[PDB]
Amino acid sequence: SREQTMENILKAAKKKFGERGYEGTSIQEIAKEAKVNVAMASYYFNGKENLYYEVFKKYGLANELPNFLEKNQFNPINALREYLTVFTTHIKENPEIGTLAYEEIIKESARLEKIKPYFIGSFEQLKEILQEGEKQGVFHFFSINHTIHWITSIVLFPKFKKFIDGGLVSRIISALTDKPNI
Amino acid sequence: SREQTMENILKAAKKKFGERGYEGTSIQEIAKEAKVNVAMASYYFNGKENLYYEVFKKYGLLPNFLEKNQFNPINALREYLTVFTTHIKENPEIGTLAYEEIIKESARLEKIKPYFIGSFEQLKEILQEGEKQGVFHFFSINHTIHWITSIVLFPKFKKFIDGSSGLVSRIISALTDKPNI
């Protein structure tokens, strides 16, 4: 329950920060939310900022993903479909990671630099998969860089889709496999 | 310069709302920033909520670009995206405030949604024209509108993810599948 308390505080951390973002959340509240003293949470994670990063360390993507290409006999479409589903599902399960990360990103906050490392491996697996598919002639795009940009931009911002209107994985796949007439 | 005064209030509201969000700003901070008393602000805008919306009206977002560009969807799109981009770069609070409203899904969203609505029906017409002239190639118009508006409306994302070619240029090359020139 030392371990349980810690998880409770982290679980709380994710919940509160998500509702109000970094500025607006207080340790008091997270303490309160996990049902422990302020003191305990400030001791275990030494302050707000560290507790903030620990939430990304704990709930982010950093060691969650296997090697999808390998796992899929190097069929790139299957590899991407599985990568995107696991990426979007991991966020759907911990949505603050995406909401908070996207905020820090569009605001280019000072926190961004120490948050990014919890995303970097997932972007670079995306790149490898896209490049293998391009190599095999199954994906077609003009720039790997542009493509990685629009894919991660919409995957990390699920709510923008509904706002825009009122299926994502297959739309990303259909976009990539479409071969231009030319 | 009663317009200049109103402007000052709008400028101050954008700035102050930008920094703390709708909840964490008040007419006092805004009024102070604009160097008028609250009564002046209340006079012209009557309340934080309405001020908020006036900011979007004042700073959100238009000519018909296919027409302005002789029914050429490439140039029409390049101009449209270039104007969209410049604007968001000068008015970054719009993006961040929109982000928060979309994320939080407040009543306020539906009122401010309108100040993007128009932009995106035009984007759509340009894309569809370019498809039929065979210069743009994409599987889904709606999926294309989606990732385009997503990356144009939050251009800082680009810099995080690129951690070396222009946003507008990259979008055009993605659709034409050709070097942008």
From TrEMBL, chain B:
PROSITE patterns: HTH_TETR_1, HTH_TETR_2. It comes from the Bacteria. Keywords: DNA-binding. PANTHER family: HTH-TYPE TRANSCRIPTIONAL REPRESSOR SCO4008 (PTHR30328:SF54), TRANSCRIPTIONAL REPRESSOR (PTHR30328). One of its GO terms (molecular function) is DNA binding. GO terms for biological process: regulation of DNA-templated transcription. InterPro entries: DNA-bd_HTH_TetR-type_CS, Homeodomain-like_sf, HTH-type_TetR-like_transc_reg, HTH_TetR, NicS_C, Tet_transcr_reg_TetR-rel_C_sf. It comes from Bacillus cereus. Residues 3-61 form the HTH tetR-type domain. SUPFAM superfamilies: Homeodomain-like, Tetracyclin repressor-like, C-terminal domain. This is Hemolysin II regulatory protein. Pfam families: TetR_C_29, TetR_N. Residues 26-45 bind DNA.
